[model samples]
Target: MIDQKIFETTLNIDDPTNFCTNVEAHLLKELENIYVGKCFKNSFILNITGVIQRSPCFIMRTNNSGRGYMHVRFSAVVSYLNAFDLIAAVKIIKNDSNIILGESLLTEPVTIVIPSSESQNNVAEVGQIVPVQLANSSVYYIPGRQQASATGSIFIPKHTFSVYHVQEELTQEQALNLTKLVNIIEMLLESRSKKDFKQICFFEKLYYTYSISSDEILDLKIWKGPKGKEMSRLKPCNVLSFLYDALKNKNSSLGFWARPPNLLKSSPLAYQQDQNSFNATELPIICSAEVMFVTLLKEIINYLQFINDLCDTFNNEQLIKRHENIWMLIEQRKIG
Candidate 1:
């Protein structure tokens, strides 16, 4: 039997303001209704009903096709005495109901640690430093040290061969414009690959090149690159097409961009040259730009979860005079 107090405590801590707390509060209210024997037929049905209505972390669908019996679907469930739990939400259905929770759906969250400490330490160990050009044409040396030629005991300051650019910070308007540009690029990449070409005309077309204008910066252009020596070195088209192709065909190459390659390798593209070979075409194109797309997707999930929790909170706060389509409000919010 599941201990109600302990279960509720777990829910309260897991995601206190979201799925966990929302379900716990609703289940407690349902238990109160069962105690009063107010509108429910029995405690069993009350608990089952709570499970059907409260849990937000799971996907649920109900069918009333049977003449007098209602069917509730769950991948799986946990039973304790007369009550059951799905995720953190408790309810009661039946002893042998195949509604138990499934392991496949319950998985750990994916955490991405950016700028790993190991990578920084490796740079320092090698006495490698990078020079970056500022907007004012000033140069800044980073990881500022070199290995001492004499004793080789410690790293010392020395001239570095590597250089990178450090662009000035973007204004608020420019930042917003950059986001818009990225969204358009993602849409174009996805739609073009799907052959849904009709939607590609939102921007101006100059012959084969497509241009998206912004008040804060120059118009962004998409065009194929030149041939021969500069064939793969063209402007926007090569970059954009490369990104699209990588996203479509290079699943294995995604990890490379997240880490620095070993200097001992004759070529960084050596991994691709092997039988399990990969190429520049396989590497993550515009690595930093990909973050915008990922963040946008996460934002969408956050919005949906927020709306779901709001609906659950509302249901928990209201007194149950009778059963209705309690989830309709949630559905409507999702639509909006």
Candidate 2:
């Protein structure tokens, strides 16, 4: 921790980026230096909420039209929190009625994320760039730009981490089922928090100047999706539509939430290749640790079972009892 005066002097900021990618990678390199007692060494995703507090260069958007001097701080979130990967939605903030420039100056840094195990790089590198808004978001990042500021992470032990990837080819229904599992678990464990977005705009970016579906989601230079490849200025697709673009891409996998093995399926949903590795319900998301695996398992068991009971209870067709009939049988008191 150094003074704002002391901190600002040495770093040279001459590159084209929204933030100081040099400092961004420099600090990320610091985090990457942290080592474990018995495992591999890389960056971490723990307690990063310290407001990594980066200083954005005092420059406004150069290309924005007509006095559009805007510098908005945006962020995203990812599951399996590894500090190396940039995940989640990019949230640009402002007042209820004000724009990024209209709102006064003070801005903050964005976050970046991780996953599970083996010798080699088990997790693929996911890089995201918010490209030129040939469509809507007028902030056009120069082609071939690199987004080191666009990185983020979270930490999970090997025994029980969450991840979603499907190597084999699959139909949309199968993909839908896979998404259903992740979405349900995420919806359940996602207790309303102190700060939650009114709506998730990560997928919304898919319809913009920047796109995220490609054979390799690395580096900002490569354009993706209809908007990027065709310069279509595509309209927003549903969140799942973005995932649909994501899932079909090279080595594409996405999803995370609290655990449960009890949510296994009746008919083995086809995900993996062979029978030995094929358990459709378990394929997409699984726990890896010792007791922790069971922890998420039991919680998911009751959660799904709880949903099962409620599903029938709220059934419109099953008219079993009424306010009048139930009151008639009430031992305490009843109106004749």
Candidate 3:
């Protein structure tokens, strides 16, 4: 039987928002120490339920359930490299279980959602400098020389996560089976949540981004379709079109970089090859959407099984009913 105290701790820790403030503080301190070459000020704001909070980055308890939730906002106009460094630093801090649990008595993987802040009216010009307004009191200028200046804030897009690259080449049959498995699981989720499958792609992205074994890409390549056309490469548009057709009517898309398999090949081929091996038949595909859906499905099943056992042990009617409802949904969708 699962311990009630442990279960409660798991719930508290599993909510990623609980660790954002601590992560932000830690990241700021780390950035200050490491970023000596650049002159930047700390203008970050933490947002919670539309209220902006300043400094010391404390957790906010919401009125609804007293749950701690907060969003980290950087008010500085930092270079893309600097932004990546800060994000990587925060991820490192978030993954340190000792620091997280020791300080807050809880821990969870944090998801930083960076929304698009593009300005359509502005025509980007070479050497064009424009004043930039921040969420906080601070303001800065975007140098026209910067390549990324045309785009709005250079925040990382939502659903981007560190992923593992898979070395094994998947046969067409195997890949199709995996795709079918993903479809079934997604259908089940959509039926249960009363939300369109497209809405849940973010969750799928996160699941694939973080969960897969390092370096193994989910083989989503299809050899032949009803059109009898051969797909040599998986373009972002084609992939998005396929996803929409397979999952739901709503249009949804995720951007990814596609490169030749040789680029993935390491130098000093023999010695380095042993370190990180590669598959021989490498076809062009999106690293982002490949295998995460199936991985998430497996995880969900395992989690529900655990919850089902826990409910049985405690004889909790509410938990049992919820479990039953989910099981029926899965059955209705004809998914395991």
TM per prediction: 0.15, 0.17, 0.18
Off by over 4 Å in 2: 1-86, 91-108, 111-275, 279-336
Better of 1 and 2 by TM-score: 2
The 10 consecutive residues of candidate 3 with the worst lDDT sum are 1-10
Give each model's whole-structure lDDT. Answer: 0.23, 0.26, 0.27
Worst 10 residues of 2 by lDDT: 1-10
How much RMSD separates candidate 3 from the native structure? Answer: 22.9
lDDT of 2 by residue, 1-336 (tens): 000110111232334353245655544443333211111111112221222244544543564332212222212121122122212122222222211211101111222211122111122212211111011112212222222122222111112223333233434555555565445444443331111221112222212222324433212121111122221222211233333453575322322322112212111111212222322345444322212223333334333323232232323323223222321222122111
> Where does candidate 1 stray beyond 4 Å?
1-67, 72-216, 222-240, 247-336
Considering every candidate listed, which one attains the maximal TM-score? 3
Tell me the lDDT of model 3 at 253: 21
Please provide, for model 3 over 1-336, each residue's C-alpha lDDT reduced to its tens digit, 9 standing for 90 to 100.
000110000112224464454765544444344332232232111111121233343334555454543233333323221122111111111212122110100011122222233431122122221111112222232222211111122111222222224343333454465565445444433343443323232222221212222332322232110111112443223332344344543532233222222211110001111121223344433333335334333433332222222222323345334434322322232111
Per lDDT, what order, best first? 3, 2, 1
**Cα shift from native, residue 17, model 2 (Å):** 48
State the TM-score for model 2. 0.17
